Amino acid sequence: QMRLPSADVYRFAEPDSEENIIFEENMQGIPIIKAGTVIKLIERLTYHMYADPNFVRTFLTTYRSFCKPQELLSLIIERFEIPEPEPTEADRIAIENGDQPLSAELKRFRKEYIQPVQLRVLNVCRHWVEHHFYDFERDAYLLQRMEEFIGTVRGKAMKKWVESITKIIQRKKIANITFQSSPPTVEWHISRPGHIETFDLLTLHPIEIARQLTLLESDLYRAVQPSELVGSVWTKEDKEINSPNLLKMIRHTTNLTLWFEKCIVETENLEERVAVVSRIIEILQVFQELNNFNGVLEVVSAMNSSPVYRLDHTFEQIPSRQKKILEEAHELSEDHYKKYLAKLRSINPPCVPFFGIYLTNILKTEEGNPEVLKRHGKELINFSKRRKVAEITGEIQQYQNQPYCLRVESDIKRFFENLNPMGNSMEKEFTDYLFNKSLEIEPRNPKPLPRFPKKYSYPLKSPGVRPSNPR
Amino acid sequence: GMTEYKLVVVGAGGVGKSALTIQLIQNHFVDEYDPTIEDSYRKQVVIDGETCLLDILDTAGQEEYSAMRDQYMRTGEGFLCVFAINNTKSFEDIHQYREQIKRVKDSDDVPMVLVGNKCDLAARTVESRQAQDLARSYGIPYIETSAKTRQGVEDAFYTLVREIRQH
Amino acid sequence: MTEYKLVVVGAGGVGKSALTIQLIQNHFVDEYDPTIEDSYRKQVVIDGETCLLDILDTAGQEEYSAMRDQYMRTGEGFLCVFAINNTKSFEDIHQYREQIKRVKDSDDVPMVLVGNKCDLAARTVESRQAQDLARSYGIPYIETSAKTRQGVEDAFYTLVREIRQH
Ligand SMILES: Nc1nc2c(ncn2[C@@H]2O[C@H](COP(=O)(O)OP(=O)(O)NP(=O)(O)O)[C@@H](O)[C@H]2O)c(=O)[nH]1
Ligand SMILES: Fc1ccc(Nc2c3c(nc4ccc(Cl)cc24)CCCC3)cc1Cl
Ligand SMILES: [Mg+2]
């Protein structure tokens, strides 16, 4: 076994003890850290014995809750700067006789301790810059320090990565898809291409509605960074500052749900309303086919809302096969999303997950676990809590990789980007309006059902949700 | 074979709401939680000598999904309406939550409790007398809880179960 | 769902990272940024079964040659990559094969031989030559292009099949 530098000149050579590090009982074949000092966390982050790139992502995603970015940079620079040992007795004797020392211990220490640790420090810098660049975006001095450190690393052994990381940093400062097969043809119904003024729920093709919403919702899903999640910042005062992508995504979902509800209760005529609901369930069907689970729940939420859920006369006339489609989608959310979670884990991506349960799990993980563990008089960073958060952000990221093979239709995309069912009204008054509309079109028992004039001048018959294909 | 109560926690985000259900379900005696595993929101308890099963839905963190409120609420037979005692806005929100619950359940008499939660050591801005008055005007119990010490947590959930049993 | 630990090894610059990122993101990386050690996950349905792939992307540069043992211990299967326009990278393959066998102390390690950059006309390693070596190892040989996606899924999912039947 290799001798180490004295802990007096190199802090990362302190022996492991239960006062500075605690392991999970379960291996995997590398140890799992339950808790430790920052020093010990950083030593294991850059350990000479093994690599653990997943630890790097975990640490870089979550470290800010126990260490400042400026301090992290200081510590890994400190980790990088390893003293070499002095010649041994055998070396000494060779030198005293005018011979070249074998330097066996020095060479082994360079090869098996210094170079792996330095390389792994560089790997942290690389990951930090490529995947967590916001620390540098928000603090230019931190970036200057990083550039300086990287730019002044000497020695032929690190040279390739140092030159690379320098270039990577420069690129990141001033800052595409291949398939596999071509996307299916864009489908059109009553509204023809270019006629955005006629675009509406029943006039667009239900297939193309689902596709373009799935593209939109996928882009929104894919844009959310871990920095919008860690620290539960999307729930705090500065949420619009710290979580703008998450909140845009959630607001899209909310607006689509409200739009479905509005389309339904503003269709006073029963027969037409049945056509509207049936079209929405068809759009749900295409969402399921595309694994757009956010889109699925958008519809389900709308159908279970107070204004819509109570429309018994409408539900009555919905074909039994669509009732089953709706009920099956609803059952995904039952028992704390038990069937949703099983389905997400079994499908072939691309998909659009429902983000909501990730937020709840991250919030609760962070709220229900202490920041530190107290052991033998010492305060240790509770790292298993951070690993739990990083497992959730990691799963989020895993589903953000796969792009949809679907063609954008710019006008339909724009139509849904600009959807604004609430208009200038505040939520409560719009929401009270929807429910009053519901009461109007289907009054409570024992009030008899009124009739209402039709409002749609074009045909109500759906073109269906099976895709067509000309030569 | 025992009775199972479907309990739903509602209230403003960002002010320690999730601590209530976590402290209930929690180990007790060990500060730890994995919301990811089942049994993290289900709990067998004895209330006035009758054993029952608590299923608690707390979607803390999803407050911005405001159009999902109705569907989440629909699932419950009893409700905890939670505000933070250092956040007046969360207290003023209570009325709309109650109105929304009534609408979803289609009833003027839904088992619910009002819960004032102390989530940190910041200054209180909602006096307990204000919350008492509000609760009395609604005809529902009021319980104050601490998010750190577990005080009042059992009382909040047990009281709600009594409201259900006596409905 | 079963989890598979895949490891991609081979000389520097043969396109290990480009292959991996094409698989993960459907995107061709044009830049040549030497890897130290990167990790990717992919949920995918292969032969009707849902898998979770953990892909370890490794360093080809010789300066990192002393750090291979540690990733070879965890790997269940290995993509051994060379570039068909780089004879030396083909000659380096046998050193990876032997080290993997040594580290795992087994003659029976799931493996696929991959000849990358098959989109380039200027070939210097002939398919027959690579095929002969693959046969001597008892493993399949697949030619790929990280740029066009040719053979990319075939190479990775074949490795998965071999881990499955191992
Ligand atoms: N034409 C073509 N170029 C490719 C292909 N695969 C990789 N390249 C190019 O070759 C270079 C090296 O790719 P890279 O993936 O970084 O190789 P690597 O094996 O990961 N290198 P390292 O061992 O240092 O990490 C890049 O410029 C990349 O664009 C391919 O299939 N076709
Ligand atoms: F047009 C409608 C109007 C309203 C509804 N509401 C629903 C009703 C029932 N079960 C449901 C199950 C699940 C969803 Cl999501 C909604 C449901 C049974 C009672 C009757 C209303 C459904 C349709 Cl199709
Ligand atoms: Mg690489």
The annotation status of B60 as a binding-site residue, yes or no, is yes
For B48, other C-beta atoms within 10 Å of its C-beta total: 9
Which residue CA neighbors atom 2 of ligand 2 most closely? A315
The CATH number for C65's domain is: 3.40.50.300
Report which ligand 1 atom has the smallest distance to the Cα of C29.
Answer: 29
Given resolution (angstroms): 2.3
| Domains contained in chain C, number | 1
DSSP codes of every residue in B24-84: HHS-SSS----TTSTTSSEEEEEETTEEEEEEEEE-TT-TT-GGGHHHHHHT-SEEEEEEE
Q: Which-ligand-closest: CA of A328?
A: 2
The annotation status of C33 as a binding-site residue, yes or no, is yes
**What CATH number belongs to A184-355+399-468?**
1.10.840.10
Task: Show which subunits contact A, needing at least 3 CB pairs below 8 angstroms.
Answer: B, C
Hey, is the C-beta of A448 within 8 angstroms of any chain C C-beta? no
CB of C145 sitting under 6 A from ligand 1: yes
CB of A389 sitting under 6 A from ligand 2: no
Which of A235, A261, A306 lies closest to B103 in CB terms? Answer: A306
Report which of A167, A173, A108 is spatially closest to residue A136, judged by C-alpha positions. A173
CA angle C20, C93, C115 (to 5 degrees): 50
Whose tokens are 């094969």? That residue is C97
Residues 6+ apart with CB under 8 A from A142: A69, A70, A73, A135, A136
C-alpha dihedral over B40, B46, B48, B52, to 10 degrees?
70
CA A388 to chain centre: 14
Interface of B with A (CB under 8 A): 13-14, 16, 18-19, 22, 26, 31-36, 38, 41, 57-68, 70-71, 74, 96, 100, 103-104, 106
Q: Alpha-carbon distance A129 to A121, whole Å?
A: 12
Instruction: Identify the closest residue of chain A to C46 by CA–CA distance.
Output: A348
Whose tokens are 């094409």? That residue is C22
Is A370 in contact with A382 (CB distance < 8 Å)?
Answer: yes
DSSP codes of every residue in A98-122: TPPP--HHHHHHIIIIIHHHHHHHH
Is C160 in contact with C5 (CB distance < 8 Å)?
Answer: no
Report which ligand 1 atom has the smallest distance to the Cα of C35.
Answer: 25
C-chain CB neighbours of A398 within 8 Å are 41-43
| H or E element at residue B5 | strand B3-11
3-state secondary structure of A36: strand
CB of A327 sitting under 6 A from ligand 2: yes
For A369, other C-beta atoms within 10 Å of its C-beta total: 19
Is A310 in contact with A265 (CB distance < 8 Å)?
Answer: no
CB of A277 sitting under 6 A from ligand 2: yes
Hey, is the C-beta of A328 within 8 angstroms of any chain B C-beta? no
Report which ligand 2 atom has the smallest distance to the Cα of A304.
Answer: 15
CA B48 to chain centre: 20
Q: Alpha-carbon distance B103 to A59, whole Å?
A: 46
Ligand 2 centroid distance, CA of A48 (Å): 60
- Sheet with strand B50-58: strands edge to edge: B42-47, B50-58, B3-11, B78-84, B112-118, B142-146
Q: Which-ligand-closest: CA of C143?
A: 1
Domain ranges within chain A, ordered by starting residue: 3-173+356-398, 184-355+399-468
| H or E element at residue B144 | strand B142-146
CB of C97 sitting under 6 A from ligand 1: no
Interface test with A, best of C1, C16, C38, C43 (most A CBs within 10 A): C43
A-chain CB neighbours of C64 within 8 Å are 119
Please give the residue range of the domain that contains residue C56. 1-166
For A140, other C-beta atoms within 10 Å of its C-beta total: 9
Hey, what are A228's tokens? 């919008």
CB of A315 sitting under 6 A from ligand 2: yes
3-state secondary structure of A277: helix
| H or E element at residue B145 | strand B142-146
CB of A284 sitting under 6 A from ligand 2: no
| CATH level 3 topology of A3-173+356-398 | Son of sevenless (SoS) protein; Chain S, domain 1 (1.20.870)
Hey, is the C-beta of A374 within 8 angstroms of any chain C C-beta? no
Is A447 in contact with A310 (CB distance < 8 Å)?
Answer: no
Which residue CA neighbors atom 12 of ligand 1 most closely? C13
Q: Which-ligand-closest: CA of A164?
A: 1
- Whether A and B touch, i.e. at least 3 CB pairs below 8 A, reads as yes
- Sheet with strand A378-382: strands edge to edge: A21-23, A33-36, A378-382, A372-375
Is C112 in contact with C93 (CB distance < 8 Å)?
Answer: no
3-state secondary structure of A313: helix
Is A305 in contact with B70 (CB distance < 8 Å)?
Answer: yes
Query: Which residues, in sequence order, are bridge partners of residue C141?
Result: C113
Question: Which is it for strands B50-58 and B42-47: parallel, antiparallel or unpaired?
Answer: antiparallel
Name the phi and psi angles at C40, rounded to 5: -135, 150
Instruction: Identify the closest residue of chain A to B58 by CA–CA distance.
Output: A360
Which of A50, A123, A157 lies closest to C70 in CB terms? Answer: A50
Question: Which is it for strands B3-11 and B42-47: parallel, antiparallel or unpaired?
Answer: unpaired
Which residue CA neighbors atom 22 of ligand 2 most closely? A315
CA B20 to chain centre: 7
- Is the preceding peptide bond at A180 cis, omega within 30 degrees of 0? yes
DSSP codes of every residue in chain C: -EEEEEEEE-STTSSHHHHHHHHHHS----S----SEEEEEEEEEETTEEEEEEEEEE--SGGGGGG-HHHHHH-SEEEEEEETT-HHHHHHHHHHHHHHHHHHT-S---EEEEEE-TT-S---S-HHHHHHHHHHHT--EEE--TTT-TTHHHHHHHHHHHHHH-
Ligand 2 centroid distance, CA of A327 (Å): 8
